[PDB]
Write an enzyme that holds these catalytic residues in place. Structure first.
Site, PDB file in Angstrom:
ATOM      1  N   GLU G  59     -23.400  16.005 -24.184  1.00 20.45           N
ATOM      2  CA  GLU G  59     -23.239  14.839 -23.324  1.00 20.45           C
ATOM      3  C   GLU G  59     -24.134  13.699 -23.790  1.00 20.45           C
ATOM      4  O   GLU G  59     -23.741  12.527 -23.744  1.00 20.45           O
ATOM      5  CB  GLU G  59     -23.545  15.208 -21.871  1.00 20.45           C
ATOM      6  CG  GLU G  59     -23.398  14.061 -20.877  1.00 20.45           C
ATOM      7  CD  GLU G  59     -24.710  13.350 -20.591  1.00 20.45           C
ATOM      8  OE1 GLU G  59     -25.736  13.717 -21.200  1.00 20.45           O
ATOM      9  OE2 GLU G  59     -24.716  12.427 -19.752  1.00 20.45           O
ATOM     10  N   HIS G  60     -25.348  14.026 -24.231  1.00 22.30           N
ATOM     11  CA  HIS G  60     -26.260  12.997 -24.722  1.00 22.30           C
ATOM     12  C   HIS G  60     -25.724  12.330 -25.981  1.00 22.30           C
ATOM     13  O   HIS G  60     -25.662  11.099 -26.067  1.00 22.30           O
ATOM     14  CB  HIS G  60     -27.639  13.595 -24.989  1.00 22.30           C
ATOM     15  CG  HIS G  60     -28.352  14.034 -23.752  1.00 22.30           C
ATOM     16  ND1 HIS G  60     -28.725  13.157 -22.758  1.00 22.30           N
ATOM     17  CD2 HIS G  60     -28.765  15.258 -23.349  1.00 22.30           C
ATOM     18  CE1 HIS G  60     -29.329  13.823 -21.791  1.00 22.30           C
ATOM     19  NE2 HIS G  60     -29.367  15.098 -22.127  1.00 22.30           N
ATOM     20  N   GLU G 136     -37.083  13.451 -21.244  1.00 23.31           N
ATOM     21  CA  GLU G 136     -36.310  13.365 -20.009  1.00 23.31           C
ATOM     22  C   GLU G 136     -36.597  14.533 -19.079  1.00 23.31           C
ATOM     23  O   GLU G 136     -36.575  14.372 -17.857  1.00 23.31           O
ATOM     24  CB  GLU G 136     -34.816  13.306 -20.324  1.00 23.31           C
ATOM     25  CG  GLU G 136     -34.313  11.948 -20.765  1.00 23.31           C
ATOM     26  CD  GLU G 136     -32.817  11.941 -21.006  1.00 23.31           C
ATOM     27  OE1 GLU G 136     -32.155  12.951 -20.689  1.00 23.31           O
ATOM     28  OE2 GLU G 136     -32.303  10.925 -21.516  1.00 23.31           O
TER      29      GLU G 136
END
Lengths: 54, 54, 101, 31, 51, 418, 411
Positions: G59-60, G136
């Site tokens: 997804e990143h 993150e």
């Protein structure tokens, strides 16, 4: 708030018996104190019935 | 399944739990008393006067 | 020296607080001086002491013992509470000495 | 915080009777 | 008492009626068992040891 | 179908749509706002929007809350510096009850003093939660440091006014600002005849004008909030044109040239000139946008930067330079078209949600009185030329700056340095 | 007109099946904008311990480069079109969607194909994503609500692959090689495990043509709830977070609506919310509340008392209020192109079909006070719960106390 924390008698009972902070590692020896009270109750009850004829 | 009906009918509501507890108490009292009396009578058969009085 | 060190090591091993992962200062009785010494401990040492005491309580409740590898070693023990307790006792004795004059 | 892995409790879990098609609800009811 | 005169309280009573009946049965059977009434304990198939 | 901004004889602008969505949405937009209060009753509006659920003349607080819940609808109050909206959402067959609740809340509130006193502590919590995001706090300090008369009034009541907002002030504000000519009733799901009926219920509303005043004079002041935060949020602004003007469109297109927000999840903002400039300016995480607000009396176009304290100055300087480069005329045509596409898409996508569409229609009715279809908005956006954008950049660069900052502030330049 | 008529007014969502298996769905409307997205039935639940963070990492880096155009080019095209490219990943679903103008429908769809079919996994970009994700995770550690929910999932499912977090452990993301990501893509991102859903101003025929053009190259071809608890004590934190849940039915279960009504039916708590997180065959029904150090016990008592009251004494007025609340939430949620597009994709992924609003209203109408109390007793009454507490957690009752509070001695 639960009823145990509202009625003053329930307050005392909950604070002293239901929700009393007690160490987890307490061994069997700490039972005996409670047993003592029970013994007392026994001696108060049984002996009472003995007094009715003594 | 046994539990699928037992737990759903008897052990689900605590009132039914108490009811079946009391019924079991009656039946257990009767049967256990009868069995203990039979065991005690057999163990010391002849000694007891219930047999002698016959 | 050597004889005394041997006796002290024997006593440390005989005393079972090392089996539970505790250090010597964790075992000291919590009186007022010890309470203030604990209050003066740095946050990291305070948290380490709290966790070690909690783990010892959990083990004692289970009636178990930490594995022999994880036992505290007499030759590798820190007396972290000794300076703070000595300072607190020194201050208290100074106050008493002033209060007796 | 993602190190949420609960340590294995399999040595303490109730030994399941068998690996049947019994639903988790049924097993909980039985226990 | 006036505040309790409403449909919601009737629904609540209907919901709790089985619980009340079960607790009443618990109390009655417990009393019979404790006192060994034998007026009632004669009807039960078993528990006929009171000859 | 289409809207029709019918104006009632009293002055209540009534608009209705016929979106067949099962939820009917109604909105009463009053021209009252924080700018319309003064030093005497500062912070009144903040409590005013928290007294929606208080008991009214025709309905009780308990009745209002329980009826709204049981119907399943919701009654919310939104506030900006110029307008205040009471938005009520219900099912299609449950319009009358909540409309009567809205009538009672707005036309004839009864600010019981004990209820107001009990509500006042909620002001602290609401202000604290609203200040959790640094953007709102910095923008509030920016409005305090930029204007001096009207728009400087904060949206959230000042700390000293938290426990001293008397119900008399609430009544005075309501009866001097909640008047028929300064209000607009918009119904999305509600068909027009019933909207007319509820407007008729609203027919006997106060008077026909309010105590509108002040002009939002501009000051080149600055507010510095020395905090221990590692990250510093700064915002330096210059007076743009009023809302509803071609120059306002120019400033918006300029902000979208500079970069208003992200467009790709976890994106680097390749198109954003400000992000690219600050990336080479500083290596630590940052966030740069072109703040742009427009009002009836004035406007504010500026740069908002969230950066590290030790780099703060550098960051803003870089951002400033970018606008300067556009002021010099270094504005190509491709990025202009990209920004115009961004603005048009952003407007249209905002209009999607029924809540935002209702808010837009209410704002247009309050400030214009005639609905502006999105096609006309797109045409006006396309009308903006490169020369107009250069003029807007020149106006920002040459104008007097007002800046608000919060954080360590060990390296942030002052207004004169910026 | 009426609520039922308004539901009937809602346009249907046309669904078509491609040769490879891709399910293309659309909902025509008059809006000038659209949101076109690809929903993949792949999540953290399908990831082993070796690649727990694979889906999140993909997804990143999905928007950071495709084979046809570099990531800078892709992002520049998205920005120039004025569209917004977004993605999310749950433990059971993944989604990449584009909110764009209607006239930009073709390009956007093509873009999605480039994101899915041929994803360019640049090694430098992979290392950059490694660094970013390591930052993150520490950033997300501050948010204690998400930490509490992760604790709740981990303690509730434990041995099940449903308990591992979407992000994955730090050691896992550090060691997550490119080949692992490629294998994950090969084994997971394949039709018919994917749905192309669009809403707003889109014609279903145009969407089908675009899907065949750009998404036709895709290759053609025991969960267990354990009632445990976790409590991470940190007294420096201002408020305590608690999330308590019980086993809930999966997506395919009629009881979901009754449980939604019950949750809607449900102030000591500063912020108290009720959640009904549904999965394929399991689920978590419970409540998450924030508390002061001295008020955790009272709030837990109040929540459990509400649970018991629903399970035993559920009156008609409260159930009607809950049904109205559920109807309003259902209708209001499906407002906007993005929510309806997400609903189309998820519904095709979980339920099948699209479960139109008329059926939802009929199902809610079926719900009754007797049904509510019966289903609540079925799922809530006398059930071992899963508890997750983030400090300061000291007044939180012990698990035995909570379990005892999960039933009434009066009943």
């Amino acid at each position: 708030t639960p009823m145990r924390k509202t009625n003053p008698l329930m307050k005392l009972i909950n604070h002293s018996f239901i929700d009393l902070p007690t160490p987890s590692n307490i061994s069997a020896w700490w039972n005996f104190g409670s047993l003592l009270g029970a013994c007392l109750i026994l001696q108060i009850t049984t002996g009472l019935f003995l007094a009715m004829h003594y | 399944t046994l539990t699928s009906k037992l737990y759903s009918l008897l052990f689900r509501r605590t009132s039914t739990f108490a009811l079946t507890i009391i019924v079991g108490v009656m039946f257990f009292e009767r049967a256990f008393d009868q069995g203990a009396d039979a065991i005690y009578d057999h163990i010391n058969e002849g000694k007891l006067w219930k047999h002698i009085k016959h | 020296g050597k004889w005394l060190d041997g006796i002290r090591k024997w006593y440390y091993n005989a005393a079972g607080f090392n089996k539970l992962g505790l250090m010597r200062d964790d075992t000291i009785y919590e009186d007022e001086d010890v309470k203030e010494a604990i209050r003066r401990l740095p946050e990291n040492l305070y948290n380490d002491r709290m966790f070690r005491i909690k783990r010892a309580l959990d083990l004692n409740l289970k009636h178990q013992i930490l594995p022999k590898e994880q036992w505290t070693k007499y030759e590798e023990e820190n007396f972290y509470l000794e300076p703070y307790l000595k300072e607190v006792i020194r201050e208290r004795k100074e106050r008493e000495e002033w209060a007796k004059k | 915080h993602t190190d949420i892995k609960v340590p294995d409790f399999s040595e303490y879990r109730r030994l399941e009777v068998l690996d049947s098609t019994k639903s988790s609800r049924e097993s909980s009811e039985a226990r | 008492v006036t505040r309790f005169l409403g449909p919601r309280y009737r629904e609540l009573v209907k919901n709790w009626v089985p619980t009340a009946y079960t607790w009443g049965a618990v109390g009655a059977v417990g009393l019979v068992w404790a006192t060994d009434w034998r007026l009632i304990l004669d009807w039960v198939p078993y528990i006929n040891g009171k000859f | 179908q289409d809207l029709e901004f019918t104006k009632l004889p009293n002055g209540l602008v009534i608009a209705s749509l016929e979106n067949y969505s099962p939820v009917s949405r109604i909105g009463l937009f009053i021209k009252a706002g924080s700018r319309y209060e003064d030093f005497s009753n500062l912070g009144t509006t903040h409590l005013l929007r928290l007294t929606s659920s208080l008991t009214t003349k025709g309905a009780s607080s308990f009745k209002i809350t329980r009826g709204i819940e049981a119907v399943g609808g919701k009654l919310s109050v939104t506030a900006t510096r110029e307008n205040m909206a009471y938005t009520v959402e219900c099912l299609r067959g449950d319009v009358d009850i909540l409309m009567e609740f809205l009538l009672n809340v707005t036309t004839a509130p009864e600010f019981r003093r004990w209820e107001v006193a009990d509500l006042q502590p909620q002001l602290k919590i609401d202000k604290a939660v609203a200040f959790q995001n640094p953007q709102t706090h910095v923008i509030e300090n920016l409005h305090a440091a930029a204007y001096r008369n009207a728009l400087a009034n904060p949206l959230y009541c000042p700390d000293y006014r938290i426990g001293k907002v008397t119900s008399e002030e609430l009544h005075y504000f309501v009866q001097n600002h909640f008047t028929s000519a300064r209000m607009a009733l918009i119904g999305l799901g509600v068909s027009h005849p019933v909207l007319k009926q509820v407007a008729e219920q609203f027919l006997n509303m106060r008077g026909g004008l309010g105590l509108s005043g002040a002009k939002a004079n501009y000051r080149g002041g600055e507010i510095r909030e020395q905090n221990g935060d590692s990250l510093v949020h700064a915002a330096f602004v210059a007076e743009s044109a009023v809302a509803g003007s071609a120059e306002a469109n120019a400033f918006s297109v300029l902000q979208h040239v500079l970069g208003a927000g992200p467009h790709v999840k976890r994106g680097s903002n390749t198109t954003s000139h400000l992000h690219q400039a600050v990336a080479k300016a500083t290596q630590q995480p940052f966030d740069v946008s072109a703040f742009n607000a427009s009002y009836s009396d004035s406007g504010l176009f500026g740069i908002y930067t969230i950066s590290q304290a030790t780099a703060a100055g550098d960051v803003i300087k870089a951002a400033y330079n970018q606008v300067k480069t556009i002021a010099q005329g270094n504005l190509s045509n491709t990025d202009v078209q990209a920004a115009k596409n961004k603005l048009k898409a952003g407007y249209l996508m905002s209009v999607e949600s029924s809540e935002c569409f209702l808010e837009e229609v209410g704002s247009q009715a309050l400030v214009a009185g005639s609905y502006m279809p999105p096609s006309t908005v797109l045409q006006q956006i396309d009308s903006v030329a490169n020369a107009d954008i250069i003029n807007a950049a020149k106006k920002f660069v040459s104008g007097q700056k007002s800046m608000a900052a919060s954080g360590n502030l060990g390296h942030t330049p002052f207004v004169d340095e910026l | 007109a009426t609520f039922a008529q308004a539901l009937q007014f809602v346009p249907e969502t046309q669904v078509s099946l491609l040769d490879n298996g891709l399910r293309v769905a659309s909902e025509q409307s008059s809006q000038p904008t659209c949101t076109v997205g690809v929903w993949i039935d792949v999540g953290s639940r399908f990831e082993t311990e070796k690649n727990n963070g694979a889906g999140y990492f993909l997804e990143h880096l999905a928007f950071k480069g495709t084979k046809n155009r570099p990531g800078s080019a892709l992002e520049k095209e998205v920005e120039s079109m004025g569209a917004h490219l977004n993605a999310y990943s749950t433990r059971e679903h993944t989604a990449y969607y584009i909110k764009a103008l209607s006239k930009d429908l073709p390009k956007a769809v093509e873009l999605l194909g480039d994101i899915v079919q041929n994803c360019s996994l640049e090694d430098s970009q992979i290392e950059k994503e490694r660094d970013v994700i390591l930052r993150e995770m520490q950033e997300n550690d501050a948010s204690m609500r998400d930490v509490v929910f992760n604790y709740l999932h981990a303690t509730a499912f434990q041995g099940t692959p449903l308990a591992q977090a979407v992000e994955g452990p730090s050691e896992n993301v550090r060691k997550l090689s490119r080949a692992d990501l490629t294998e994950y893509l090969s084994t997971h991102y394949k039709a018919p495990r994917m749905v192309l859903a669009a809403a707003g101003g889109v014609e279903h025929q145009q969407l089908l043509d675009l899907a065949q053009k750009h998404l036709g190259g895709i290759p053609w071809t025991p969960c267990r709830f354990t009632g445990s608890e976790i409590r991470h004590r940190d007294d420096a934190l201002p408020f305590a977070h608690v999330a308590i849940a019980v086993e809930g039915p999966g997506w395919a279960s009629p009881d979901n609506v009754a449980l939604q009504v019950a949750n809607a039916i449900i102030k000591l708590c500063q912020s108290f919310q009720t959640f009904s997180i549904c999965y394929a065959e399991t689920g978590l029904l419970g409540a998450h509340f924030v508390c002061d150090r001295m008020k955790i016990d009272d709030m837990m008592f109040v929540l459990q008392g509400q649970w018991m009251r629903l399970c035993t004494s559920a009156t008609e007025s409260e159930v009607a209020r809950g049904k109205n609340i559920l109807r309003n939430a259902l209708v209001s949620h499906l407002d906007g192109t993005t929510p309806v597009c997400e609903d189309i994709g998820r519904s095709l992924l979980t339920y099948g079909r699209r479960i139109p609003l008329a059926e939802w209203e009929s199902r809610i109408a079926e719900v009754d006070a007797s049904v509510v109390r019966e289903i609540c007793s079925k799922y809530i009454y006398d059930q071992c719960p899963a508890v997750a507490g983030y400090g300061p957690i000291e007044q939180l009752p012990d698990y035995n106390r909570i379990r005892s509070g999960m039933f009434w001695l009066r009943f």
